[PDB]
Design a protein around this ligand. Structure first.
Ligand code: ZN
Ligand code: ZN
Lengths: 48, 193, 48, 150
């Protein structure tokens, strides 16, 4: 049904957001990367 | 109960306070005329007030040198090395007979290890060096060999830890325990964590 | 722990900036980009 | 030329004998005591401002026409800040003592107050109070600061 491009696009978008945040500020976030970790794990689950 | 800690709210405005050096002290070393101290952590020092008690006319300090650095070490002897790893903070000259001195730092210094040197001494050479009072029984002993004829004890030995400084016969500070006879020095700090 | 992490991040960023500036000033064709007084505060670790 | 070189000599350290004699002949030559005090104040402040400008010159901070521009994004070091602070503390002391002379300077040399305001953005948080004190002495006034201190 075409969920692989969806997950890939989500991963690329959140990585771009992470880079944009990294360039500008220096604040901390204890939950950073949780969504990306989950999406990558889901993609691996679809791929194995 | 907040997920993202707010830098505005976790950082209040802590004011400066008067702390005695020995309370932050962790480790020290003493040589003939220099003193190395390590604190529990880092501190923003603003003023250092130094008090002198039980001073002797024979010798005291004319110029005091203060050094600092913000590199954490586990052994004092490692950081005892003179030239490479210190930053000078202030040079203070003392009029004769001073008991208290106010080393005012124009900029507060962030430091973890500190260094105090007696750069120059106002000295009284009228003291008799050929004949010295015995540290044990107060008997007059000649300089050579320095062994008392009343009790058989040495003169160059420390009055506190009984260590003989064979290198410097008359050191300002003891090389083993750091006992000083010429004066007793106390340190204050206008600092904050 | 958050304050300690923030201090470490600040110093690491300042060292990276100094190293990059030292590498850039070695090049001759590339001219140094001037910053106004406000741009310096925007760029430096002052506004962090 | 007499007042110039004479005040230049007074700031040079020497034995107190020549300093006392030179002060006496200063208070003689320069009309009256207010005049010699004003001349010393103005000369000292001009020298201090030149020192500050050269110090910032050394590290890439350039005041071209009225804008202060920086070439390096890296902050300044402790020695630079201490050398800035000595000059600024002398200026702040005199401006807090006799504000009229400081105001007269700021009138004659128009690129001082704006330079201080621009440089306050580049120096760390430990040097902002003295710069703001100079700005307040120039603009807010002396009697206002005295009333505020009450
Ligand atoms: Zn004896
Ligand atoms: Zn001893």
């Amino acid at each position: 049904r075409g969920v692989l491009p969806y997950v890939g696009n989500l991963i690329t978008k959140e990585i771009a957001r992470l880079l944009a945040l990294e360039e500008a500020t220096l604040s901390t976030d204890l939950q950073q990367g949780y969504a990306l970790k989950s999406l990558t794990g889901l993609l691996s689950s679809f791929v194995e | 109960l907040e997920s993202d800690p707010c830098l505005v709210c976790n950082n209040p405005e802590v004011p400066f306070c008067y702390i005695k050096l020995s309370s932050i002290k962790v480790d020290t070393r003493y040589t003939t005329t220099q003193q190395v101290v390590k604190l529990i952590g880092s501190h923003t020092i603003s003023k250092v007030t130094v008090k002198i008690g039980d001073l002797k006319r024979t010798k005291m300090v004319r110029t005091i040198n203060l050094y600092y650095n913000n590199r954490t070490v586990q052994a004092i002897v490692e950081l005892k090395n003179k030239p490479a790893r210190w930053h000078k903070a202030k040079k203070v000259q003392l009029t004769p007979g001073q008991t208290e001195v106010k080393i005012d730092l124009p900029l507060p210094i962030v430091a973890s290890n500190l260094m105090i040197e007696f750069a120059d001494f106002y000295e009284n050479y009228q003291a008799s060096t050929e004949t010295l009072q015995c540290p044990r029984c107060s008997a007059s002993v000649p300089a050579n060999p320095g062994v008392c004829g009343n009790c058989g004890e040495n003169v160059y030995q420390c009055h506190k830890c009984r260590s003989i400084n064979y290198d410097e016969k008359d050191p300002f500070l003891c090389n083993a325990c750091g006992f000083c006879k010429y004066a007793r020095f106390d340190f204050m700090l206008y600092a904050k964590p | 722990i958050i304050q300690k992490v923030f201090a470490s991040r600040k110093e690491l960023l300042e060292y990276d900036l100094q190293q990059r500036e030292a590498a850039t000033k070695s090049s001759r064709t590339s001219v140094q980009p001037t910053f106004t007084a406000s741009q310096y505060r925007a760029l430096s670790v002052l506004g962090c | 030329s007499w007042f110039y070189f004479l005040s230049e000599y007074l700031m040079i350290q020497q034995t107190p004998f020549v300093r006392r004699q030179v002060r006496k002949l200063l208070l003689f030559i320069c009309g009256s005591k207010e005049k010699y005090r004003q001349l010393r104040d103005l000369h000292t402040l001009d020298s201090h401002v030149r020192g500050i400008k050269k110090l910032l010159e050394e590290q890439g901070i350039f005041l071209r026409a009225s804008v202060v521009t920086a070439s390096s994004g890296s902050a300044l070091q402790y020695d630079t800040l201490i050398s800035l602070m000595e000059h600024l503390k002398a200026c702040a002391e005199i401006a807090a003592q006799r504000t009229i002379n400081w105001q007269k300077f700021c009138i004659k040399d128009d690129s001082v107050l704006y330079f201080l305001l621009q440089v306050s953005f580049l120096v760390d948080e430990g040097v902002s109070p003295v710069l703001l004190q100079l700005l307040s002495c120039a603009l807010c006034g002396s009697k206002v600061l005295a009333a505020l201190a009450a």
